Amino acid sequence: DRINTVRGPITISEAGFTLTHEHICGSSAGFLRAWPEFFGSRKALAEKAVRGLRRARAAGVRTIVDVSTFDCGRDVSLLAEVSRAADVHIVAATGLWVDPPLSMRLRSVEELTQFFLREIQYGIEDTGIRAGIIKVATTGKATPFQELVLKAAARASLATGVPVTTHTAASQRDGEQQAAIFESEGLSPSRVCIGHSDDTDDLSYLTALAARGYLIGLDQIPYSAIGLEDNASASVLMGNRSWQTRALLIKALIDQGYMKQILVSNDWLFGFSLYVTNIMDVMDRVNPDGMAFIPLRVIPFLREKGVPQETLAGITVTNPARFLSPTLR
């Protein structure tokens, strides 16, 4: 009945309005520490991030879940710093993303399980800060290594009650194989969110997962490259569908009986080193609201379309709490 944050455990009520897939900095292990000038400076990155969280907070956001893993450039100390400065809860992640180093790629499923358990039960690095979620990733059919990561995440979840959240290629219908591997590990679908699921309009894929009891992460709502057509990065990054097209999936799933399975987010960041050098400026030009995009634009959008207050509050408050609070079922 307690969710771990970068400032300690909080109760369920304290979580409140939660964004379930966000980042402070999108990068690689040690990159921020080794080359902060890439982000202007570590101080500039911090100030940017604090200003963003304060705006999100003014918009009603109380908690975010930072789903940056070790190899995804998680700097937990930075997460801790910005959290106290903005008074926004940040839940830190363990697991692995799509770019694990050789030191991880050579590990067994038993060692991977030990490491995830470390970051959950013991602490991240030497900070004593505990991960509150496990993040895994595939882009298309799982590699032999990604099979181990997924099995290991399932095992860490089953041992702690901490949930698993995923990065997918929705077009490749990644969730159907992620689901198959998790259920073979005996992991409850109620402990899993299949993310990036808003990247496609394939509703039959989404309700199949939602029917099994998975959580559906519609977590890139503001992502759109419309207007920035010839920008290579922004197109592979954000695709061609409008934000209103991504947000309609929320109503569509509400209308098929699955509002209790919907988690919503921006997948926003304040630093991003994994594309063209200036990808953060380009994303900022697309979404000047940042993390406040969900509460300022998406929530009113759905209200205008007839979705009651009661249902919206359930998606952004009740759903993340049920999901994040440690349990096996």
Residues that constitute the known binding site for Zn(2+):
21, 23, 135, 167, 196, 267
Site for a copy of itself in 277-296 (CB under 8 A): 277
CB of 309 to Co ion, least distance (A): 28
Please, what is the minimum distance in Å from the beta carbon of residue 113 to a copy of itself?
12
CB-nearer residue toward a copy of itself: 35 or 87: 35
267 contact, one of a copy of itself, Co ion, none, CB 5-8 Å limit per kind? Co ion
Other beta carbons less than 10 A from residue 87's beta carbon: 11
Nearest to 177 by CA among 145, 136, 140: 140
Q: Which of 14, 81, 99, 185 binds a copy of itself (CB under 8 A)?
A: 99
Question: Cα-flanking dihedrals φ and ψ of residue 164, to 5°?
Answer: -110, 135
Under rule CB under 8 A, how many of the chain's residues touch a copy of itself?
36
167 near Co ion, judged by CB under 5 A: yes
Determine the Cα–Cα distance for residues 219 and 223; give it in Å rounded to an integer: 9
Stretch that binds a copy of itself, among 250-258, 271-279, 298-306, 313-321 (CB under 8 A): 271-279
Position among 273, 287, 311, 316 found at the interface with a copy of itself (CB under 8 A): 273
- Distance (Å) of CA 7 to CA 87, 89, 127, 130, 325: 10, 8, 11, 9, 16
The interface partner of residue 306, options being a copy of itself, Co ion, none and the CB cut-off 5 to 8 Å by kind, is none
What is the nearest approach in angstroms of a copy of itself to the Cβ of residue 249?
28
48 in contact with Co ion (CB under 5 A): no
Residue by residue, DSSP assigns 245-275 as HHHHHHHHHHTTT-GGGEEE-----SEE-SS
CA nearest to 25, candidates 44, 61, 49, 43:
49
Contact 263, 64 (CB under 8 A): no
